[PDB]
Write an enzyme that holds these catalytic residues in place. Structure first.
Site, PDB file in Angstrom:
ATOM      1  N   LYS A  12       0.713  -1.476  -9.812  1.00  0.00           N
ATOM      2  CA  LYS A  12       0.441  -0.429  -8.841  1.00  0.00           C
ATOM      3  C   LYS A  12       0.106   0.667  -9.057  1.00  0.00           C
ATOM      4  O   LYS A  12      -0.022   1.239 -10.173  1.00  0.00           O
ATOM      5  CB  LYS A  12       1.920   0.652  -8.564  1.00  0.00           C
ATOM      6  CG  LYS A  12       2.337   1.398  -7.651  1.00  0.00           C
ATOM      7  CD  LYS A  12       3.338   1.926  -8.035  1.00  0.00           C
ATOM      8  CE  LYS A  12       4.164   2.921  -6.998  1.00  0.00           C
ATOM      9  NZ  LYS A  12       4.949   4.042  -7.270  1.00  0.00           N
ATOM     10  N   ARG A  37       1.276  -1.381  -0.020  1.00  0.00           N
ATOM     11  CA  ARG A  37       0.046  -0.088   0.401  1.00  0.00           C
ATOM     12  C   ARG A  37       1.399   1.222  -0.099  1.00  0.00           C
ATOM     13  O   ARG A  37       2.271   1.519  -0.014  1.00  0.00           O
ATOM     14  CB  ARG A  37      -1.132  -0.044   1.148  1.00  0.00           C
ATOM     15  CG  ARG A  37      -1.627  -1.288   1.652  1.00  0.00           C
ATOM     16  CD  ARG A  37      -3.068  -0.850   2.698  1.00  0.00           C
ATOM     17  NE  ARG A  37      -2.513  -1.843   3.785  1.00  0.00           N
ATOM     18  CZ  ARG A  37      -2.380  -0.944   5.583  1.00  0.00           C
ATOM     19  NH1 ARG A  37      -1.957   0.019   4.683  1.00  0.00           N
ATOM     20  NH2 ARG A  37      -1.715  -1.438   6.486  1.00  0.00           N
ATOM     21  N   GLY A  38       0.492   2.241  -0.199  1.00  0.00           N
ATOM     22  CA  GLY A  38       1.295   3.100   0.060  1.00  0.00           C
ATOM     23  C   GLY A  38      -0.057   4.578  -0.125  1.00  0.00           C
ATOM     24  O   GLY A  38      -1.375   4.848  -0.141  1.00  0.00           O
ATOM     25  N   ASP A  95      13.628   8.707  -2.764  1.00  0.00           N
ATOM     26  CA  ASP A  95      12.636   8.673  -1.603  1.00  0.00           C
ATOM     27  C   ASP A  95      13.542   7.013  -1.276  1.00  0.00           C
ATOM     28  O   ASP A  95      13.093   5.895  -0.969  1.00  0.00           O
ATOM     29  CB  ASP A  95      11.435   8.025  -1.860  1.00  0.00           C
ATOM     30  CG  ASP A  95      10.700   7.833  -0.733  1.00  0.00           C
ATOM     31  OD1 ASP A  95      10.998   8.002   0.380  1.00  0.00           O
ATOM     32  OD2 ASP A  95       9.397   7.501  -0.928  1.00  0.00           O
ATOM     33  N   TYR A 138       0.124   7.502  -1.977  1.00  0.00           N
ATOM     34  CA  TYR A 138      -0.843   7.544  -3.365  1.00  0.00           C
ATOM     35  C   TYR A 138      -0.951   6.398  -4.143  1.00  0.00           C
ATOM     36  O   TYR A 138      -1.145   6.454  -5.565  1.00  0.00           O
ATOM     37  CB  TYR A 138      -0.740   9.393  -3.817  1.00  0.00           C
ATOM     38  CG  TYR A 138      -0.423  10.332  -3.418  1.00  0.00           C
ATOM     39  CD1 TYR A 138      -1.411  10.996  -2.436  1.00  0.00           C
ATOM     40  CD2 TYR A 138       1.070  10.711  -3.929  1.00  0.00           C
ATOM     41  CE1 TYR A 138      -1.007  11.438  -1.800  1.00  0.00           C
ATOM     42  CE2 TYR A 138       1.283  11.998  -2.632  1.00  0.00           C
ATOM     43  CZ  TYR A 138       0.246  12.668  -1.575  1.00  0.00           C
ATOM     44  OH  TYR A 138       0.041  13.565  -0.670  1.00  0.00           O
ATOM     45  N   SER A 139      -1.207   4.909  -3.695  1.00  0.00           N
ATOM     46  CA  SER A 139      -0.999   4.230  -4.184  1.00  0.00           C
ATOM     47  C   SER A 139      -0.969   2.902  -3.759  1.00  0.00           C
ATOM     48  O   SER A 139      -1.452   2.449  -2.624  1.00  0.00           O
ATOM     49  CB  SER A 139       0.410   3.914  -5.390  1.00  0.00           C
ATOM     50  OG  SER A 139       1.009   2.317  -4.679  1.00  0.00           O
ATOM     51  N   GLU A 140      -1.519   1.844  -4.033  1.00  0.00           N
ATOM     52  CA  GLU A 140      -2.260   0.522  -3.814  1.00  0.00           C
ATOM     53  C   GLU A 140      -0.628  -0.736  -4.646  1.00  0.00           C
ATOM     54  O   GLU A 140      -0.998  -0.070  -5.926  1.00  0.00           O
ATOM     55  CB  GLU A 140      -3.791   0.508  -4.013  1.00  0.00           C
ATOM     56  CG  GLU A 140      -3.633   0.616  -2.871  1.00  0.00           C
ATOM     57  CD  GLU A 140      -5.631  -0.602  -2.358  1.00  0.00           C
ATOM     58  OE1 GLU A 140      -6.024  -0.986  -3.326  1.00  0.00           O
ATOM     59  OE2 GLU A 140      -5.813  -0.261  -1.369  1.00  0.00           O
TER      60      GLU A 140
HETATM   61  N1  LIG Z   1       8.709  -4.704  -7.852  1.00  0.00           N
HETATM   62  C1  LIG Z   1       8.249  -5.056  -6.629  1.00  0.00           C
HETATM   63  N2  LIG Z   1       7.922  -6.316  -6.528  1.00  0.00           N
HETATM   64  C2  LIG Z   1       7.533  -6.595  -4.949  1.00  0.00           C
HETATM   65  N3  LIG Z   1       7.568  -6.009  -4.357  1.00  0.00           N
HETATM   66  C3  LIG Z   1       6.520  -5.431  -4.517  1.00  0.00           C
HETATM   67  C4  LIG Z   1       7.598  -4.427  -5.919  1.00  0.00           C
HETATM   68  N4  LIG Z   1       7.211  -2.803  -5.862  1.00  0.00           N
HETATM   69  C5  LIG Z   1       6.495  -2.517  -5.111  1.00  0.00           C
HETATM   70  N5  LIG Z   1       6.484  -4.067  -4.248  1.00  0.00           N
HETATM   71  C6  LIG Z   1       5.839  -3.591  -2.667  1.00  0.00           C
HETATM   72  O1  LIG Z   1       5.242  -2.654  -2.892  1.00  0.00           O
HETATM   73  C7  LIG Z   1       5.091  -1.674  -1.809  1.00  0.00           C
HETATM   74  C8  LIG Z   1       4.471   0.021  -2.050  1.00  0.00           C
HETATM   75  O2  LIG Z   1       5.521  -0.042  -3.675  1.00  0.00           O
HETATM   76  P1  LIG Z   1       5.386   1.066  -3.818  1.00  0.00           P
HETATM   77  O3  LIG Z   1       6.034   1.535  -5.626  1.00  0.00           O
HETATM   78  O4  LIG Z   1       6.596   2.015  -3.039  1.00  0.00           O
HETATM   79  O5  LIG Z   1       4.289   2.292  -4.085  1.00  0.00           O
HETATM   80  P2  LIG Z   1       4.049   3.761  -3.089  1.00  0.00           P
HETATM   81  O6  LIG Z   1       2.453   4.083  -2.502  1.00  0.00           O
HETATM   82  O7  LIG Z   1       4.960   5.077  -3.599  1.00  0.00           O
HETATM   83  N6  LIG Z   1       5.240   3.347  -1.200  1.00  0.00           N
HETATM   84  P3  LIG Z   1       5.282   4.865  -0.101  1.00  0.00           P
HETATM   85  O8  LIG Z   1       6.077   5.428  -1.024  1.00  0.00           O
HETATM   86  O9  LIG Z   1       7.178   4.164  -0.460  1.00  0.00           O
HETATM   87  O10 LIG Z   1       5.044   5.248   1.122  1.00  0.00           O
HETATM   88  C9  LIG Z   1       6.703  -2.328  -1.368  1.00  0.00           C
HETATM   89  O11 LIG Z   1       7.504  -1.247  -0.117  1.00  0.00           O
HETATM   90  C10 LIG Z   1       6.786  -3.476  -1.614  1.00  0.00           C
HETATM   91  O12 LIG Z   1       6.639  -3.793  -0.337  1.00  0.00           O
HETATM   92 MG   LIG Z   2       5.914   6.791  -3.808  1.00  0.00          MG
END
Ligand SMILES: Nc1ncnc2c1ncn2[C@@H]1O[C@H](COP(=O)(O)OP(=O)(O)NP(=O)(O)O)[C@@H](O)[C@H]1O
Ligand SMILES: [Mg+2]
Length: 330
Positions: free
Chosen positions: A63, A42-43, A151, A45-47
């Site tokens: 994503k 999760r994130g 980041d 601005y994302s899941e």
């Molecule tokens: N290529 C990948 N392989 C495995 N797990 C992944 C991969 N990409 C993302 N994840 C998982 O998804 C989580 C969140 O991915 P992320 O691309 O950082 O989204 P985000 O919403 O931008 N998170 P953040 O900004 O760090 O709060 C990661 O911390 C991993 O556990």
């Molecule tokens: Mg991010």
């Protein structure tokens, strides 16, 4: 007020076709060719989901970006497309969106990761030199392409320890570096923010990623997660001040004509510099060496212009076992 030490030229000499992400036109893939299996993350601005590209029946990550500050989306795609084939950078497989809501997703390669709080304590000394070196490779590459990740942290470093492979993920905060641009300081996560972010200095560059790298490293070798544990962004600068010292902070502020905000008057005391050796324990001693401490010390510097470049940091003696090991493999 600040230009970067290296790679300042890059976006100028590469064309506007390299950095002008507003005018990128996305050739969307077919949303229905992907099937979402299970939630893996999760994130803000994302899941993120484990998923299957149906026509090939293969594992991947999808994503789903929930903002629609729509040129922030174009930026992440343009950077992923630009960094293609870079050492240790997540592979970009597709961009798709829902036909009705126009919500976009980014499709990347799956990496079988162990979450770092579990994985990091299982590392040997050599592991740490090895996985930091591979990460330096990703950072150096994109820096040499005029991009700042902004980041860097354990959560965005997927590691398949059995495959001994590393991918740097999450380029949602990545921006292009243009000399003299005032960038947003509300980037990175709290524990890995640079002093420049915390004092509202906007003319930063690729060296921000190196401070973040050093936060990671420091928590790996001293087995203290996070290494700098502020309750807020102001306390973040106090907890860095207790290690690096308030003397060298003030010399840095004067060096950059930064005026510290008045809130810090009551919370920031005079702190002596704590030597790195006071963080050496019995439980964390396996990771400790002179080479390591010296290398951390050249990462974690108030003045970003005093930090190692990723290229320089690969040259460091700490990594020589990794270099010669790879050389004998060849
Ligand atoms: N290529 C990948 N392989 C495995 N797990 C992944 C991969 N990409 C993302 N994840 C998982 O998804 C989580 C969140 O991915 P992320 O691309 O950082 O989204 P985000 O919403 O931008 N998170 P953040 O900004 O760090 O709060 C990661 O911390 C991993 O556990
Ligand atoms: Mg991010």
């Amino acid at each position: 007020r600040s230009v970067a030490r290296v790679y300042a030229n890059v976006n100028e000499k590469l064309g506007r076709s390299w950095w002008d992400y507003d005018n990128l036109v996305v050739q969307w893939g077919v949303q229905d060719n992907y099937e979402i299996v299970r939630k893996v993350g999760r994130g803000k601005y994302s899941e993120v989901f484990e998923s299957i590209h149906l026509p090939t029946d293969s594992k991947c990550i999808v994503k789903v970006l929930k903002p629609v500050k729509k040129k922030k989306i174009k930026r992440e795609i343009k950077i992923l497309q630009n960094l293609a084939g870079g050492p240790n950078v997540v592979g970009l497989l597709d961009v798709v969106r829902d036909s009705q809501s126009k919500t976009p997703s980014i499709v990347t390669e799956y990496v079988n990761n162990t979450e770092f709080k579990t994985l990091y304590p299982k590392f040997s000394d050599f592991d740490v030199r090895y996985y930091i070196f591979e990460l330096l490779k990703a950072l150096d590459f994109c820096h040499s392409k005029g991009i700042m990740h902004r980041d860097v942290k354990p959560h965005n470093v997927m590691i398949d320890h059995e495959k001994r492979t590393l991918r740097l993920i999450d380029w949602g905060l990545a921006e292009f570096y243009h000399p003299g641009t005032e960038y947003n300081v509300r980037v990175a996560s709290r524990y890995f923010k640079g002093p420049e972010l915390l004092v509202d200095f906007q003319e930063y560059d690729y060296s921000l990623d190196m401070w973040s790298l050093g936060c990671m490293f420091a928590s790996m070798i001293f087995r203290k997660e996070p290494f700098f544990h502020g309750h807020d962004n102001a306390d973040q600068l106090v907890k860095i001040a207790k290690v690096l010292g308030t003397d060298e902070l003030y010399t840095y502020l004067e060096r950059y004509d930064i005026d510290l905000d008045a809130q810090f008057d009551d919370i920031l005391g005079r702190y002596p510099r704590k030597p790195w050796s006071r963080f050496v324990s019995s439980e964390n001693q396996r990771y400790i060496s002179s080479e390591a401490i010296d290398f951390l010390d050249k990462l974690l510097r108030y003045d970003h212009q005093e930090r190692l470049t990723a290229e320089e940091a690969k040259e460091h003696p700490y990594f020589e076992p990794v270099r010669q090991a790879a050389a004998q493999a060849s």
